[PDB]
């Protein structure tokens, strides 16, 4: 009797979000439906293009039910306010959505409440102004959850999906696989943060006040995360956007999606995560941030940045062709970023950042230039009490304990932090004949902070952290090297 999707987001151990309000920008809704009656308030804001109450109310009514519905909701009896920005055929405009977002911000200024989650179950093409408006509203301290989009495409090409400071949600089904929708289906890619149940989702039907219908889509999926976020914020009202995103990632089910469904290039870029509520001491959260592809230009660099309240603990790079000049950790505005260099004749590279929540942290980078005509380039965290959390390396040519080692022709960069509460170890795995990739994983209860390939003459395409596993990609032998840390209390 428990709907598959509500069971699916239930953690392995488990016992609303009442001080949180959720805003919904969608179609009009049947507010007196028994699932939501009394808990959803219609603002009567409307801004919709020109084109039956039940048909018109269908999409928004269902979504309101998914978030907060009395029987089939995620955050049963959480408060919602709804704005109408989609018409009866489910169509809206960017300007309309802009005005709705502005309306939410004005209301908050006029009458402040607690944490606000804004659900945007809609998508259009990439929009500079819509993305800026979402970024702005997020920097004002609001949480935005949006649909990845249903075009079986890279979500970075749509908005608000592609806006970096919103949480973008793809749809998976009861088999934990990406949802197909006609000839299309859930979007994917590095602009998608995680997936959630988005097929055969039962919820309020606007056909009648007690009726129910089953719907599919990344809107439904986004509704699940909006409700999960409402619950997380109710329990921990002080969470920042970065802290909330790291928890969503951490409490998600890992690696249950079969990546073969995605096109080849998008498999590394797409988080294999299906959302779940927390099971409900301090511990170390890290996440992997992929940059936009740098592009083919000769002096092209890709940059991966952490949130302001995160630390960058390591930096790797990847290229499909393998034509790359590595990566470096550098400071911008006084925050370290991850910067990768394309090979002059290459198609481009990704920079890949490992971003962690480490408050009691003073970190820094140590760099040594190429040693040349030596064994190799070395550098290490020299002072006592400091731990190495990542190694990086970048070179200028086209041909070639607490310590990082690099090729004799490359510069070497170590990330060093003073964090006494922290313990780290290095685990290595080498494969003589790499079939395609070599991986090594941190032990259960440890967090991967750093992932790299042991230097040599291997034609490695690069390396990246996938959750707590270090992956090195190859075209002697190839060795994956993971740096793992955990708190000690």
């Amino acid at each position: 009797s428990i709907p598959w999707n509500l069971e699916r987001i239930t953690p392995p151990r488990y016992r609303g979000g009442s001080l949180v309000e959720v805003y919904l920008l969608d179609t009009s809704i049947q507010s007196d439906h028994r699932e939501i009656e009394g808990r959803v308030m219609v603002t009567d804001f409307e801004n919709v293009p020109e084109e039956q109450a039940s048909k018109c109310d269908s999409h928004g009514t269902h979504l309101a039910g998914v978030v907060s519905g009395r029987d089939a909701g995620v955050a049963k009896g959480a408060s919602m306010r709804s704005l109408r920005v989609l018409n009866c055929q489910g169509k809206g405009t960017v300007s309309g959505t802009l005005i709705g977002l502005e309306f939410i911000r004005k209301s908050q200024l006029v009458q402040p409440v607690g944490p606000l989650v804004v659900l945007l179950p809609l998508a259009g093409g990439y929009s500079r102004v819509l993305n800026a408006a979402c970024q702005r509203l997020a920097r004002a301290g609001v949480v935005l959850v949006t649909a990845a989009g249903n075009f079986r495409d890279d979500a970075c090409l749509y908005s608000p999906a592609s806006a970096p400071e919103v949480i973008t949600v793809g749809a998976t089904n009861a088999q934990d696989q990406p949802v197909t929708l006609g000839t299309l289906g859930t979007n994917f890619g590095r602009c998608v943060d995680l997936f959630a149940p988005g097929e055969d989702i039962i919820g309020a039907s606007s056909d009648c006040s007690t009726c129910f219908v089953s719907q599919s889509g990344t809107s439904q999926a986004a509704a699940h995360v909006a409700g999960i976020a409402a619950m997380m914020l109710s329990a921990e009202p002080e969470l920042t956007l970065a802290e909330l995103r790291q928890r969503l990632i951490h409490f998600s089910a890992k690696d249950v999606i079969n990546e073969a469904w995605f096109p080849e290039d998008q498999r590394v870029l797409t988080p294999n995560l299906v959302a779940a509520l927390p099971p409900s001491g301090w511990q170390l959260f890290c996440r992997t941030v992929w940059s936009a592809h740098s592009g083919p230009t000769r002096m092209a660099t890709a940059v991966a940045r952490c949130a302001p309240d995160e630390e960058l603990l390591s930096c790797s790079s990847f290229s499909r062709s393998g034509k790359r000049r590595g990566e470096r950790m550098e400071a911008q505005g006084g925050k370290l970023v991850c910067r990768a260099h394309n090979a002059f004749g290459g198609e481009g590279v990704y920079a890949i950042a490992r971003c962690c929540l480490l408050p009691q942290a003073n970190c820094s980078v140590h760099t040594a230039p190429p040693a040349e005509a030596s064994m190799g380039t070395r550098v290490h965290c020299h002072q006592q009490g400091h731990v190495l959390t990542g190694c990086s390396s970048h070179w200028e040519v086209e041909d070639l304990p607490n310590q990082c080692v690099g090729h004799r022709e490359a510069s070497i960069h170590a990330s060093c932090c003073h964090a006494p509460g922290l313990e780290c170890k290095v685990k290595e795995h080498g494969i003589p004949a790499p079939q395609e990739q070599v991986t090594v994983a941190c032990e259960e209860g440890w967090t991967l902070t750093g992932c790299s390939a042991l230097p040599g003459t291997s034609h490695v395409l690069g390396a990246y952290a996938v959750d707590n596993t270090c992956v090195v990609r190859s075209r002697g032998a190839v060795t994956a090297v993971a740096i793992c840390c955990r708190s000690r209390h």
């Binding site: 969608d26 179609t27 293009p49 999409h59 920005v85 989609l86 489910g90 169509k91 809206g92 405009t93 960017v94 300007s95 309309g96 959505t97 802009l98 005005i99 977002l101 502005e102 911000r105 004005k106 200024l109 179950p121 809609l122 998508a123 259009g124 093409g125 990439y126 929009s127 500079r128 102004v129 800026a132 408006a133 702005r136 509203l137 004002a140 649909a147 990845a148 989009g149 249903n150 090409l157 889509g217 990344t218 809107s219 986004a222």
Partner: protein, 92 residues
């Protein structure tokens, strides 16, 4: 120097309406005078315009119904950061 943008998905474009986005610092009062200045300059050139909405709260600027002929002119208005042609969004 201000730039112009429209949806790369052609069928999703809504020409004839534009979002004029002003520089971050721009104050509501300046936004309103910029919009009045556009209508006036537009009028001297024979063009009807309609200011559908002035933004304050997240993003300074305004929504204007006008011919695209006026975009070069609008891009030279004071305080303009960029202008984006409106486009469609769809329930997912």
């Amino acid at each position: 120097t201000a730039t112009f943008h429209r949806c790369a998905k052609d069928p999703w474009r809504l020409p004839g309406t534009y979002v004029v986005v002003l520089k971050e610092e721009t104050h509501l009062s300046q936004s309103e005078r910029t919009a009045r200045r556009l209508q006036a300059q537009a009028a001297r050139r024979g063009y009807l315009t309609k200011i559908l909405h002035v933004f304050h709260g997240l993003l300074p600027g305004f929504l204007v119904k006008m011919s695209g002929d006026l975009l070069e002119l609008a891009l030279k208005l004071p305080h303009v950061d960029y202008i984006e042609e409106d486009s469609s969004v769809f329930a997912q």
